[PDB]
Amino acid sequence: WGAQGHRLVAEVADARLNPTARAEVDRLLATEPDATLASIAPWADQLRAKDPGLGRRSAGWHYVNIAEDNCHYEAPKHCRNGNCIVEALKAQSTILGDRSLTDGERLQALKFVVHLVGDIHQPMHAGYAHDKGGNDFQLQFGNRGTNLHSLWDSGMLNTRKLDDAGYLPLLQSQRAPKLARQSNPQRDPQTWAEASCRISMQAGVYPATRKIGDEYTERYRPLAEAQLRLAGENLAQLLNRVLGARLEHHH
Ligand SMILES: [Zn+2]
Ligand SMILES: [Zn+2]
Ligand SMILES: [Zn+2]
């Protein structure tokens, strides 16, 4: 996603944290002036201008392009060296949960987890390798040139003309999505990537013309918006498991 999609996933999630995860997220965020779950959500996309070294190391962590293999993930083939979103999200979840690490290490892992749960729910981050997740599919959208990747990351969301305060309650108004019965941080990333890939491959998502407009928006923007809500609910369920699961009896 672009920055608004990432923030909206975080804002949906933030309100769904259990008290244990609420306290721990807030404690990690408090170590960085002005940080909120929403404000850190775009951070991993900004690393060219914030941390170039980490930016180079983590560029491939935003994607897993499995569509040519019918959306059936295989880590050795699709994720050599762990360099894809499935394995990155698993590892960063482990790091985030490791209370023996420094607050700085765990806050960095939180930034990645918040961002990557968003990206792994973006269909065009789990699509074809050969066209760079739809980036090479250039099209006219209304009167403007774009590409299929950008259309899904931000172009359709932008048609609402809403800031986050207007968009958030619209996402919250949707019918509740069906989640996994319990979060498994090591297994769910593959499930989510495969589901996102199947959307990339659904009828008409790749359009039959290179001039699209309101008919495309009206059919597919609801699906993009459903994926934001789903991503936010899944992010809260994951943070509740990773940061909200300690067996505690102190008053
Ligand atoms: Zn993104
Ligand atoms: Zn993207
Ligand atoms: Zn990203």
Three-state SS for 180-241 is CCCCCCCCHHHHHHHHHHHHHCCCCCCCCCCEECHHHHHHHHHHHHHHHHHHHHHHHHHHHH
Q: Where are the domains of the chain?
A: 3-243
Q: Which residues contact 52 (CB under 8 A, 6 or more apart)?
A: none
Q: How many residues does the chain have?
A: 251
This structure's resolution (Å) is: 1.1
Q: Which ligand is nearest to the CA of 126?
A: 2
Please give the sequence-ordered ranges of beta strands (E in DSSP) within 56-105, or none if there are none: none
3-243 has CATH 1.10.575.10 classification:
yes
Please give the distance, rounded to the nearest whole angstrom, from the Cα atom of residue 40 to the centre of ligand 3: 12
Please give the distance, rounded to the nearest whole angstrom, from the Cα atom of residue 119 to the centre of ligand 3: 6
> Which is it for strands 211-212 and 138-141: parallel, antiparallel or unpaired?
parallel
How was this model experimentally determined?
A: X-ray
The separation between CA 240 and the C-alpha centre of its own chain, rounded to angstroms, equals 17
Please give the distance, rounded to the nearest whole angstrom, from the Cα atom of residue 46 to the centre of ligand 2: 12
Q: How far apart are CA 12 and CA 67, in angstroms?
A: 28
228, 12 in Cβ contact below 8 A? Answer: yes
Nearest Cα neighbor of 43 from 150, 115, 105 is 115
Please give the distance, rounded to the nearest whole angstrom, from the Cα atom of residue 148 to the centre of ligand 3: 16
95, 106 in Cβ contact below 8 A? Answer: yes
* CA angle (183, 10, 179) in 5-degree steps: 30
Please state the three-class secondary structure of the chain as a single string.
Answer: CCHHHHHHHHHHHHCCCCHHHHHHHHHHHCCCCCCCHHHHCCHHHHHHHCCHHHHHHHHHHHCCCCHHHCCCCCHHHHCHHHCCHHHHHHHHHHHHHCCCCCHHHHHHHHHHHHHHHHHHCCHHHCCCCCCCCCCCCEEEECCEEEEHHHHHHHHHHHCCCCCHHHHHHHHHCCCCCCCCCCCCCCCHHHHHHHHHHHHHCCCCCCCCCCEECHHHHHHHHHHHHHHHHHHHHHHHHHHHHHHCCCCCCCC
**What is the arrangement of strands in the sheet containing 211-212, beginning at the earlier edge strand?**
144-147, 138-141, 211-212
Please give the distance, rounded to the nearest whole angstrom, from the Cα atom of residue 30 to the centre of ligand 2: 29
Amino acid letter for position 182: Q
Q: What are phi and psi of 144, to 5 degrees?
A: -125, 140
Mutual angle of helices 19-29 and 103-120, in 10-degree steps: 110
Q: How far apart are CA 14 and CA 201, in angstroms?
A: 31
Which two tokens mark 169? Answer: 């309650």
Q: What are phi and psi of 76, to 5 degrees?
A: -65, -35
Q: What does the DSSP 8-state code read for residue 19? A: H
Q: How far apart are CA 159 and CA 138, in angstroms?
A: 18
Q: Which ligand is nearest to the CA of 9?
A: 1
